[PDB]
Design a protein around this ligand. Sequence first.
Ligand SMILES: O=C(O)COc1cccc([C@H]2OC(=O)C(O)=C2c2ccc(Br)cc2)c1
Lengths: 254, 259
Amino acid sequence: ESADLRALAKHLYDSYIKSFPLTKAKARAILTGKSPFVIYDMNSLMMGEDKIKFKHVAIRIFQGCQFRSVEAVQEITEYAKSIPGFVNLDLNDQVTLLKYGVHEIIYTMLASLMNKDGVLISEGQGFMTREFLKSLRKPFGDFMEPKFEFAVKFNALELDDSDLAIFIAVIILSGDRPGLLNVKPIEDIQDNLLQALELQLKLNHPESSQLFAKLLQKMTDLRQIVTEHVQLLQVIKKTETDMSLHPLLQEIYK
Amino acid sequence: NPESADLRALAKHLYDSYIKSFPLTKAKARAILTGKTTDKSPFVIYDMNSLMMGEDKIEVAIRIFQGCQFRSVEAVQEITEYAKSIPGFVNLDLNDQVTLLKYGVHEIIYTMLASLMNKDGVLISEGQGFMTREFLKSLRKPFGDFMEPKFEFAVKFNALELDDSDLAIFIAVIILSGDRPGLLNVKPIEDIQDNLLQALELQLKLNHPESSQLFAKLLQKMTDLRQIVTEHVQLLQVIKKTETDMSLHPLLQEIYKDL
Ligand SMILES: O=C(O)COc1cccc([C@H]2OC(=O)C(O)=C2c2ccc(Br)cc2)c1
């Protein structure tokens, strides 16, 4: 029966490449060796915007992160709709799985762009450092540090795009999202996704023992930082006197 | 097969210490919850009257919470005894044995508490009593919602149909976690958890053969345990600042100390 598990592994990987432009393999090449722009202080921030083409002082960084998250949701939605059985679910269930899922996949693939010294920005064309992300006014000065502590641990598992492709699918098909209407089949697809993930990590990582069990424990983490960032997204709602400009622009970021 | 036999010896050793460390197991709790015995029948507490009459074995809202933390201290004592029997735990650094226990005990307590709970209430007083879920939820604020997260997780967790032999290994995996803040020597802990995870995977393969992917579905429940600890922690901070005379316990207040 593992013939179908190997089929599903490459089907999800091929769709992973089409839905996501900047893959982990191409981000690892940029982080080590061609070079992009480096934003390390306040001068290189303004210097960046000139020759980088952004699409939007301390709030300009956060608003750009929400612009990138909106583009990410579209890539995650298109990728999820290619998972076998996803589009054949209840349309309300598909909306719910994506609603409570995109935040966890955003940080999983964000780690693919992070090391211990910074993160890539604007499709690998730039690079914001770690210390510059702790030198902003509150509460911006400490909303990326939990995500850097997580990216260090998660990337230590040292997975590739084919492992991540299956791992992304399992997070979307989580059958415990509040408000589901047909919890059965969602757990059915996630059951075969977990089999394909268990098989994938054995054939690609034969030396690392219980990489499948250690990967599932990172989900326990993942949600703890998603629910922590959610409660931080309402500190920006109540603080800063510059987080409400064009009303049509507020509707996009929901 | 010779290496899988080494994992069976580990599984039987953990189950042996489990029986010897926790007096009330899930096997005995299910014999009490389901009314199949004429001798292990509990006195049900459902209102104020059944409370004062069942006082032979056990402010109302405060008195209920005092006994909850009294049993929590009883639980930590049993968890520490069982952790010492896990192979390698006592061989680690003494600072790490305290940190693995500091963040691990509550995730263990809510796991085994689910063995004493059905959808209608919780076993209390060593199985002699049974406090209803409605009465626990009918307590005044902020105590009227102190138990619903525990109950909602139990009916979800008990669906896995795990017995004490599977629970023994899953308890050991939670204690020997490398993801806990303050671990000085992380790698020697990850080696022990790797051995416990191999034993748990084989245990569920043999004890639950028809149940597919029970190993992955069980490891996902650790995400539920974290949110209960965080919601619990948030709730004590409100009680500490409202009931100013409400005093804790050396075992509990030092676990919540900058958790
Ligand atoms: O004392 C009162 O009137 C109300 O407080 C009570 C009432 C009943 C039982 C107890 C405690 O004693 C025990 O043996 C026991 O397990 C207690 C207990 C406390 C909280 C939860 Br949850 C489960 C059990 C305290």
